[PDB]
């Protein structure tokens, strides 16, 4: 019997159980339930991580210090190990002797209390051959009488679907609901536990560090309750500081350490950007201009949106940014997004809306098809964002998507989170949302039929307004209208493509140099307002890659490089010279 | 895998809930980190606090084979916990940890392997390392918020196309010895 039941009161003397701070209201009802004549068995029901076992163990702790009523004084609490009780019970009746022997001890003592953690397990603990003789059916007649006191602990899930199924057993237990404490209460809770964590890690926690752990955990750590989230941050900070520096070790735990810990847990940058990454953000816009020419309004919108978030001015419950990039083809709508992720060194989440044309396909984003019994039924968008909280979300050709897809984004842009059918909450507060559409190109390119030409400048927005409902557009941080590439910008584009060609040749050991005059000739051949910069690749392919390709396979370009390109004004044709 | 091991060593040093979890796609070195940690410990490449530490690789199938009784599973499983409780530094490596949530030896009952270890993991009595796929972690795991809370997710992703070459170089001697051949540098790349 001693092996199955662990005396919690004894552990309190040696320190084995953490102290209980607060929970006076919860305990008050528990003592009232325990002092009842019949069915004096409290049941602690609450979400995991909110100190349910701490209250049952805390009672044993408080008894040692004399912080309970006289009626509670002199009472011991026992914790039942179901596995130990069921072990070696192959023979008939073995489980019965151990369970009845335990009950006889409680009934005889008249002052002991049993604490069956995870009480949902005793429903069929002793069932054999589909037998109905179980721990619950045996204990039942001893609970209504009031001879024994039992303290339970079960989440709302397990309680509702397992414990509540047995109406008889559930009646005998009085559900004491435990709500996660407030931020003010959690800091007090950590202050009480802090001396134990400090001793384990041989470190000291500053008062400000404790407050940050609670406040930051609420903001950036989801699917975890507050008293558990903060302890997780506090525990990790002690572990990291203790073993990271072999020498030159900081005994104290500053606020910066807490910020770094939450960053690792949430896979998001911390608030120390003012020193380390200040250079990267300052040069973000400049670097994106070299890669993408023109369209500076889009670069400024993206970089400024990022700066505000890192500086602490970003929206509390909205993504870093939501920008609809609409314009002509080959203007950099889908290039600036791919380069932004590379500049920041963060995962790029690319979703092609061409697939999500129909209503039923939209369900894949937030779940799985109807009745998909097979596993891996998690939404592509929800699971992708959870894996990478810091990332760039690109929804190419959002106009093609079914109107029902805009309803999905309303909670993303305005509330910052999207929930899957299963219920997992995806956080979008730190992802940059960029959508690309060619909605207004047709209207702008349309030519009027009249004596006087019309200024079709606002027609693009009108088309955008029709395709996107006002609620969706309102949530957008800014709508950027990309414009056709100018002739001056094309020169920069030619240089960029040539640079990529040089990199490709560098792999084969060939070096290419082109004259400024030849660059200008290439620009005129490939400058098309409607097609932007994509035609430049075609002329680059036809003019340069074609001769080089033939020579590269067989000729001087096999090795040695030293290529030079020039043209004659009279001939008006490029000349390629290879000298190995 | 210094970044991955550093995060794991930090979790193992926690006062409570010092149970690392290795969540990653298939064949991305999830089990090599756990086994590799044992290899690194033997060679003295870990901190002094982690020295004198033994990793144990529990086999769930062996534990669930031959029970054929009401309490055979609990008898052997609990005995394992007693061993781990006795050795403060002992660590249990349970690959494919999603299986414990599934009834180990429970028929129409909820006395599973996961429930038995929930009190010990919360109290820091035993340290458990688990490896499971993202899809299994998202669907099989994380449903029971109780057990999920104890484990600390460590994302294990493929490092790069180039780092894999370095990895094969370290493994090349073992493979070369097995086949009595030498792999050219160009071939591995």
């Amino acid at each position: 019997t001693e092996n199955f039941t662990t005396n919690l009161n004894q552990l309190a003397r040696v320190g084995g159980i953490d102290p209980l701070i607060g929970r006076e209201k919860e305990l008050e009802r528990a003592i009232q339930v325990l002092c009842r004549r019949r069915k004096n068995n409290p049941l602690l029901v609450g979400e995991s991580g909110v100190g349910k076992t701490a209250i049952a163990e805390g009672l044993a702790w408080r008894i040692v210090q004399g912080d309970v009523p006289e009626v509670m004084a002199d009472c011991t609490i026992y914790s039942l190990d179901i596995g130990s009780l069921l072990a070696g019970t192959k023979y008939r009746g073995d489980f019965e002797k151990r369970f009845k022997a335990l009950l006889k001890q409680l009934e005889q003592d008249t002052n002991s209390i049993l604490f069956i953690d995870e009480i949902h397990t005793i429903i069929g603990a002793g069932a054999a051959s589909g037998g109905q003789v179980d721990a619950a059916n045996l204990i039942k007649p001893l609970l209504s009488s009031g001879k024994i006191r039992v303290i339970g602990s079960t989440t709302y899930q397990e309680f509702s679907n397992i414990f509540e199924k047995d109406r008889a057993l559930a009646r005998r237990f009085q559900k004491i609901d435990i709500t996660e404490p407030s931020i003010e209460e959690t800091v007090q809770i950590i202050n009480g536990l802090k001396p134990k964590y400090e001793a384990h890690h041989d470190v000291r926690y500053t008062a400000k560090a404790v407050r940050a752990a609670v406040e930051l955990a609420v903001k950036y750590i989801n699917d975890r309750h507050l008293p558990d989230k903060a302890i997780d941050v506090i525990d990790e900070a002690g572990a990291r500081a203790r073993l990271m520096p072999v020498s030159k070790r900081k005994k104290t735990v500053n606020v910066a350490d807490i910020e770094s810990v939450v960053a690792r847990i949430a896979r998001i940058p911390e608030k120390s950007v003012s020193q380390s990454d200040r250079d990267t953000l300052k040069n973000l816009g400049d670097r994106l201009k070299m890669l993408v020419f023109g369209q500076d309004k889009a670069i400024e919108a993206l970089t400024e949106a990022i700066k505000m978030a890192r500086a602490g001015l970003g929206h509390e419950h909205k993504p870093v940014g939501s920008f609809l990039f609409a314009g002509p083809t080959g203007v950099g709508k889908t290039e600036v997004t791919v380069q932004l992720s590379k500049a920041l060194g963060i995962e790029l989440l690319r979703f092609d809306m061409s697939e999500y044309m129909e209503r039923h396909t939209v369900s894949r984003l937030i779940g799985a098809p109807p009745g998909y019994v097979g596993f891996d039924q998690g939404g592509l968008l929800t699971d992708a964002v959870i894996k990478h909280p810091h990332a760039v979300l690109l929804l190419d050709e959002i106009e093609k998507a079914h109107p029902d897809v805009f309803n999905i984004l309303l909670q993303v842009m305005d509330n910052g989170t999207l929930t899957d059918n299963n219920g997992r909450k995806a956080d979008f507060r730190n992802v940059v949302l960029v959508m690309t559409t060619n909605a207004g190109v047709r209207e702008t390119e349309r030519k009027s039929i009249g004596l006087i030409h019309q200024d079709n400048s606002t027609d693009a927005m009108e088309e955008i307004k029709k395709i996107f409902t006002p609620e969706f557009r309102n949530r957008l941080d800014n709508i950027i209208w990309f414009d056709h590439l100018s002739t001056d910008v094309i020169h920069q584009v030619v240089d960029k493509f040539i640079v990529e060609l040089q990199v490709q040749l560098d792999q084969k050991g060939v070096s290419l140099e082109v004259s400024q005059e030849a660059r200008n000739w290439l620009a005129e051949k490939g400058y098309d307002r409607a097609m932007g910069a994509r035609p430049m690749a075609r002329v680059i392919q036809d003019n340069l890659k074609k001769p080089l390709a033939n020579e590269l396979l067989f000729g001087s370009l096999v090795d040695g490089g030293q290529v030079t390109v020039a043209l004659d004004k009279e001939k008006n044709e490029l000349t390629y010279g290879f000298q190995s | 895998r210094e970044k991955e091991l550093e995060r794991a060593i930090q979790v193992l040093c926690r006062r409570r809930k010092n149970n690392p979890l290795l969540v990653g796609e298939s064949g991305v070195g999830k089990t090599a980190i756990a086994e590799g940690l044992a290899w690194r410990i033997v060679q003295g490449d870990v901190p002094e606090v982690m020295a004198d530490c033994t990793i144990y690789s529990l086999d769930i199938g062996s534990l669930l084979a031959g029970t054929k009784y009401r309490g055979d599973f609990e008898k052997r499983f609990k005995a394992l916990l007693k061993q781990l409780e006795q050795d403060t530094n002992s660590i249990l490596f349970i690959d494919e940890i999603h299986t414990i949530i599934g009834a180990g030896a429970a028929s129409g009952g909820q006395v599973d392997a996961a429930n038995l270890i929930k009190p010990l993991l919360s109290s820091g009595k035993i340290r458990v390392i688990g490896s499971t796929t993202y899809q299994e972690f998202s669907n099989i795991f994380e449903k029971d918020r109780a057990l999920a809370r104890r484990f600390q997710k460590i994302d294990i992703t493929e490092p790069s196309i180039e780092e894999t070459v370095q990895i094969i170089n370290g493994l090349k001697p073992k493979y070369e010895a097995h086949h009595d051949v030498r792999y050219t540098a160009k071939a591995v790349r």
């Binding site: 192959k90 023979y91 054999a128 | 029970t67 009401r70 030896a105 028929s107």
Partner: peptide, 11 residues
């Protein structure tokens, strides 16, 4: 799976 077992002593 869980089935009770009844034993018998030799004598």
């Amino acid at each position: 799976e869980k089935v009770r077992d009844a034993l018998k002593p030799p004598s």
